[PDB]
Ligand SMILES: NC(=O)c1ccc[n+]([C@@H]2O[C@H](COP(=O)([O-])OP(=O)(O)OC[C@H]3O[C@@H](n4cnc5c(N)ncnc54)[C@H](OP(=O)(O)O)[C@@H]3O)[C@@H](O)[C@H]2O)c1
């Protein structure tokens with residue numbers, strides 16, 4: 002019997018590469034998505050063509066609300082329903098947009114940015130652990146969390162809370178054999194809405210290669226942390242940033 | 251005239267000591283409280299006896315909800331209505347209790363722990379800056395990287411607060427508003443706690459084998475708001491007697 | 499009786515500013531210097547005409563060598579010889595220049611960069627403690643230690659070591675009632691070798707005021723840490739950098 | 748032709764495990780040693796039995812001295828001499844013993860503890876870079892650098908300097924495509940001299956399984972960092988500590 006993984010926000014970009022690499026390694030996968038239904042169904046098709054009955058999709062909004070605990074329990078339940086087990090949780094889904102201090106309401110911005118980046122990872126970790134081999138959680142963090150983007154306080158607060166969660170859950174779940182770690186990209190696949198001039202600005206900042214990470218280079222670090230070569234690693238966050246966070250202003 | 255400060259959760263313990271030292275420094279103060287009305291009023295009366303019309307109280311719940319932004323705007327508004335200005339914001343109010351991974355619902359725990367420790371501070375910061383030696387001091391935690399077992403939501407809240415301190419220091423520096431943190435290790439121990447359990451913590455502290463008084467915590471806050479810290483922003487001053495340096 | 503302080507490299511710039519503020523606070527001061535004899539004696543003259551018999555000079559090379567332990571022991575001894583006590587040690591003296599990975603021998607550069615920034619503070623800390631109220635040590639650190647200047651590896655290695663000493667000495671000397679803390683400037687008084695244009699480059703990167711810290715502003719944080727207002731503070735490094743360390747590439 | 752790796756202090760324990768795993772992955776290796784000549788040749792013999800002429804030994808003292816630069820240049824040269832290339836440098840050799848603030852002179856302890864943990868890594872880095880594909884350097888760090896052992900200031904100073912070197916060299920050598928990373932054990936193979944009951948005290952503190960890391964679990968992280976799966980990673984230090992560093996006093 003093959004192990005199974007949940008990857009949140011897996012229809013596109015980095016989450017998609019993570020799901021694909023997990024699948025190539027021998028994992029059965031839940032592809033969680035919010036809006037990207039066609040891309041999700043498309044990916045599960047591709048993976049199932051390769052090895053039948055090894056991928057399903059699971060739709061959920063991960064914005065904070067009184068029903069978020071239920072939705073997170075459902076993502077984990079969907080893994081047990083399809084595969085009879087759940088060995089790996091990857092917390093990848095994330096809202097990312099500015100929220101300056103000086104059309105969405107501030108209530109909604111807090112709900113989305115803190116919900117996706119922090120509260121949903123927390124609830125998913127709870128549900129994952131309560132449902133419980135080589136078990137582990139990998140949280141997608143941010144190498145720039147101490148040198149934050151300007152006017153991104155809510156986003157940056159969420160990513161900080163995710164560091165806190167990584168550490169707290171590593172400590173608490175250790176006696177259950179569940180390891181909890183992070184991968185912190187600096188600049189990888191750039192925002193779809195970002196202009197080409199900004200993208201090149203950022204690329205020119207990276208010491209190693211003057212370019213962004215492929216989604217695949219981020220996934221590689223995720224694969225290492227879930228693997229048997231990382232059996233003593235818990236509470237660790239691996240920067241995959243080509244040296245970006247080392248460059249002064 | 252005299253500057254003015256808002257201190258959240260100022261009725262008791264550390265928040266009380268901060269409001270008192272700010273007032274002794276020459277600040278007029280808004281004493282925010284949630285449940286401790288009698289303590290908050292008794293403080294206001296004590297301070298107004300010192301100097302008339304220099305202390306007011308302001309009640310609010312700082313739990314996350316749809317009304318929290320309004321409550322936070324109103325707390326800032328009260329300082330302006332009382333004193334005509336708002337020079338200092340101290341984010342001190344905090345819920346703190348275990349939330350194990352394995353009689354409140356989890357969504358209430360999220361609302362209270364993340365609300366008080368992180369979201370309320372962010373909203374208050376927003377309202378404070380929009381209304382503008384201006385500065386904000388956030389009460390953090392020296393043990394954020396070596397957290398208490400089964401305190402994930404609290405620990406998440408305090409990490410968020412660090413992120414807030416850094417992000418707001420960056421973004422508010424052009425307006426000349428400094429944003430800093432004070433991080434206690436072990437200070438005034440919970441009210442319930444038996445002396446035998448307080449002693450376990452006190453014995454861990456290298457400097458004196460004793461917890462910080464609320465006054466020692468307030469001293470660092472006073473430093474950070476003063477003219478002696480005018481180039482200090484984005485900084486978190488540990489006040490922990492070396493506790494965070496002690497391995498398991 | 500007035501307390502006594504040793505400040506290393508105190509003939510000019512930040513070290514002078516620290517010695518002056520300690521003096522104005524009521525301390526008697528040992529003005530350590532290496533090459534700046536005229537400036538050191540000039541300073542002591544100014545302080546002594548303020549209050550008679552309150553400042554002395556002390557020459558020492560703080561380069562690493564087999565005699566460095568004797569030299570640091572003697573700097574402390576001179577505070578006791580002059581004032582009968584030594585309450586405060588400020589580790590300020592510092593060599594700062596590039597050492598590219600790809601003039602002085604490399605062994606000389608190691609000796610000067612590591613000696614001044616790390617080994618001497620360590621030896622002085624040993625001597626200060628062995629000779630032993632509000633006793634403390636303040637180490638001048640660097641807010642940019644994790645976002646270092648290009649080609650400054652040895653200088654950066656020395657400032658990181660100084661962080662480890664601050665932490666290790668806070669831990670070990672706490673039972674003796676000696677507190678050990680740091681102040682970490684970002685950009686303060688720029689090097690005299692630096693031209694106005696390069697100075698302005700640095701100035702423009704600082705969020706808080708677009709300007710460097712005055713030497714007085716750095717001295718202020720030192721005076722705080724040595725005061726009774728910081729009686730519970732040990733192993734803390736306070737950045738005084740106007741937000742510089744928070745700014746991304 | 749196979750790539751080639753230099754591993755310092757490779758005759759025993761963790762260095763030996765790193766050398767063995769690199770060799771099993773397909774590297775030719777230089778086994779550096781100081782006093783452990785017999786063990787080093789024994790290791791070389793075992794590896795050469797596996798594949799002829801794929802393992803050589805190299806003797807050097809890594810204590811700071813006037814001759815250290817030439818010694819480090821020779822270690823690097825021995826790899827080029829033996830194998831015609833040098834692809835990987837693992838800075839593992841390390842002196843570790845207490846140096847109380849309040850046998851060997853203190854200046855010897857400085858030379859050993861700072862020389863092995865920091866200055867030799869710096870000089871070897873210089874030589875490795877100067878003599879220059881998937882090139883990288885891995886530095887053996889310490890997960891407990893911020894919660895150090897009581898009375899180990901110089902050791903802790905050297906490990907902190909090694910973090911600064913990891914960062915500084917990652918930044919400066921990125922343009923050359925040389926990556927520079929760290930692996931940070933907590934408790935792995937306990938020192939031979941350590942008492943048995945004292946060893947169990949440490950094991951009982953580790954959240955993940957209340958045991959120490961095997962030397963192989965440390966080596967696993969090294970293998971990852973030098974591999975093609977870590978090609979975007981530089982300036983990163985991976986903790987392999989089973990959560991020990993997350994545990995409060
Ligand atoms: N350079 C980088 O891209 C970079 C840099 C630093 C950190 N990271 C981190 O690495 C991870 C992957 O980055 P990425 O750029 O691939 O992510 P992304 O494209 O920005 O977001 C990935 C997915 O998150 C899901 N998501 C957003 N809001 C959601 C909500 N309310 N409920 C449920 N799902 C929601 C979306 O799903 P749907 O499409 O299905 O709606 C989206 O496809 C993220 O955690 C990110 O913060 C990335």
Ligand SMILES: NC(=O)c1ccc[n+]([C@@H]2O[C@H](COP(=O)([O-])OP(=O)(O)OC[C@H]3O[C@@H](n4cnc5c(N)ncnc54)[C@H](OP(=O)(O)O)[C@@H]3O)[C@@H](O)[C@H]2O)c1
Nearest residue numbers: 259263264283284285286311312313342343344389436437
């Ligand atoms: N004490 C320590 O050893 C320690 C250690 C590390 C960090 N800290 C930090 O230092 C700060 C002060 O600590 P402390 O021990 O003095 O705090 P505390 O007594 O635990 O709480 C301070 C106040 O926060 C207010 N508060 C709690 N929940 C609230 C809510 N839902 N809405 C609005 N206000 C609420 C309460 O006000 P009412 O009484 O009016 O309801 C309470 O009096 C806190 O931020 C804390 O996290 C303290």
Ligand SMILES: NC(=O)c1ccc[n+]([C@@H]2O[C@H](COP(=O)([O-])OP(=O)(O)OC[C@H]3O[C@@H](n4cnc5c(N)ncnc54)[C@H](OP(=O)(O)O)[C@@H]3O)[C@@H](O)[C@H]2O)c1
Nearest residue numbers: 507511512531532533534559560561590591592638685686
């Ligand atoms: N200035 C800044 O923007 C800045 C930024 C970050 C950190 N810092 C730190 O803050 C502190 C003060 O900075 P600064 O710019 O005022 O310092 P600095 O002028 O560069 O040097 C201070 C003194 O160090 C002494 N020194 C140099 N080599 C010595 C040696 N071999 N033996 C004994 N003494 C030696 C010199 O004494 P003599 O002149 O008598 O020979 C010099 O005047 C330093 O630790 C520095 O690293 C400063």
Ligand SMILES: NC(=O)c1ccc[n+]([C@@H]2O[C@H](COP(=O)([O-])OP(=O)(O)OC[C@H]3O[C@@H](n4cnc5c(N)ncnc54)[C@H](OP(=O)(O)O)[C@@H]3O)[C@@H](O)[C@H]2O)c1
Nearest residue numbers: 756760761780781782783808809839840841887932934935
């Ligand atoms: N073991 C752990 O629990 C642990 C924990 C934290 C960090 N680490 C780090 O991981 C690395 C390996 O640990 P380990 O326990 O395997 O190390 P170790 O056994 O204490 O030392 C490894 C080798 O270092 C070499 N060495 C010592 N002094 C030297 C000198 N003056 N010149 C040249 N070589 C010298 C010795 O080589 P010879 O035998 O040939 O003389 C020794 O066998 C070290 O960097 C260590 O600091 C280990």
Ligand SMILES: Nc1nc2ccc(Cl)cc2[nH]1
Nearest residue numbers: 095096097188189191192
């Ligand atoms: N979700 C998300 N967080 C991000 C942080 C930085 C960038 Cl470039 C892209 C991101 N996408």
Ligand SMILES: Nc1nc2ccc(Cl)cc2[nH]1
Nearest residue numbers: 344345346436437439440
């Ligand atoms: N609010 C609050 N946070 C705290 C952290 C530690 C302790 Cl002892 C008491 C606290 N009270």
Ligand SMILES: Nc1nc2ccc(Cl)cc2[nH]1
Nearest residue numbers: 592593594685687688689
């Ligand atoms: N000693 C010394 N270290 C320094 C670091 C930065 C600057 Cl601007 C000046 C310095 N002077």
Ligand SMILES: Nc1nc2ccc(Cl)cc2[nH]1
Nearest residue numbers: 841842843934935937938
């Ligand atoms: N060199 C060396 N550094 C070390 C740090 C911790 C332990 Cl247990 C053993 C070590 N051996």
